[PDB]
Amino acid sequence: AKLVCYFTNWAQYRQGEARFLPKDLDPSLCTHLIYAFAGMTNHQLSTTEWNDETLYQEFNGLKKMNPKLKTLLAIGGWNFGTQKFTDMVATANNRQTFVNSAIRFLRKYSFDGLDLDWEYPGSQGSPAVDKERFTTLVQDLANAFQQEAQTSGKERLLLSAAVPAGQTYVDAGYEVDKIAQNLDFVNLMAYDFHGSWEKVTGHNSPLYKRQEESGAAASLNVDAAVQQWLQKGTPASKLILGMPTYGRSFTLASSSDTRVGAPATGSGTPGPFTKEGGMLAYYEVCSWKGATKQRIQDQKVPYIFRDNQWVGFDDVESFKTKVSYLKQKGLGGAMVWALDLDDFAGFSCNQGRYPLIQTLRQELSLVPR
């Protein structure tokens, strides 16, 4: 089993006990640690924060302490958008420039691989031609990594991708069967199914549908997303089930209607640390004072409300349920977005350090002996 965990290079800018610093990295929490994010400059891999090269060395310090650990560098993310990917994949020359830069950059900073997090080919401004050009990029990288391993005698660089769960984005961007031949593993973003962009409450990461859901809505859940990626050609051993250590929040139209599916007027109030209306870290929601928590019966996940605020999130119990599910489906492991949204320092939830991610590690039987 794998436990793939994302580090984010902006968590260092949160205040107080939410600030995530190198001391908070645990070398043996996860099997694979992915650094979010690199960017791109003139079609070449590049840093995004002023101290990334300091932090890259902190990553190498971890592998000295746990020589089993693998690290990858992720490129892209939601905020990065699509234009630089579109421009880089537009020609074979530009892809070659990128691929060559990536191999050199990863080797220079001792990363074990690259995670592609373009959000997303064929959507978010990216033209339809990018579906096939993304396929080509994936093959170009895989083949170049194989070639470099042959010539250098070094351990072959890994290639993964973070991929969407919803059919609209999957069918606009992803030739699943083709890219599955070339990706070492597939980090399924099995979250962000619902959120404050919608005018009724719904859960960030439900395992199954609610009975009131039909049509396309009936596929906006983890099980449907997993089955989608499997049936479209991803080997189970390569599919890594993403898990969110955050929730998505709404302002209710009325504090007297707190249903799943109740009317909402917009994003929930920003959290005191994460300062982003519409999401909350687990450590912002886990001991919420004077709130009312319950479970969505068929979806196997909790929600909580207080006055006109409503949040769908994941807890220890839902993470256990989801690991039992991934094991039943024979998947390759779990992925988690993100280290810094769990209660990484044990400051809030009275559950110790990394209560959610340690749950994943325990349920996957990955606790160091």
Swiss-Prot record:
One of its GO terms (cellular component) is lysosome. This is Chitotriosidase-1. Chitin binds at residues 49-50, 76-79, 120, 189-192, 337. Its EC number is 3.2.1.14. Monomer. Residues 1-365 form the GH18 domain. It comes from Homo sapiens. It catalyses: Random endo-hydrolysis of N-acetyl-beta-D-glucosaminide (1->4)-beta-linkages in chitin and chitodextrins. The keyword S-adenosyl-L-methionine does not apply. It is found in: Secreted; Lysosome. The gene is CHIT1. Belongs to the glycosyl hydrolase 18 family. Chitinase class II subfamily. The chain holds residues 22 to 386 of 466 of the full protein. Coiled coil: none annotated. Disulfide bonds join 5-30, 286-349. Very high plasma levels of CHIT1 are found in patients with Gaucher disease type 1 (GD I). Can be used as diagnostic aid and to evaluate the success of treatment that brings levels back to normal. Changing residue 53 to K: Rare variant detected in patients with Gaucher disease type 1. Detected in spleen. Secreted by cultured macrophages. One of its GO terms (biological process) is chitin catabolic process. The keyword Iron does not apply. One of its GO terms (molecular function) is chitin binding.
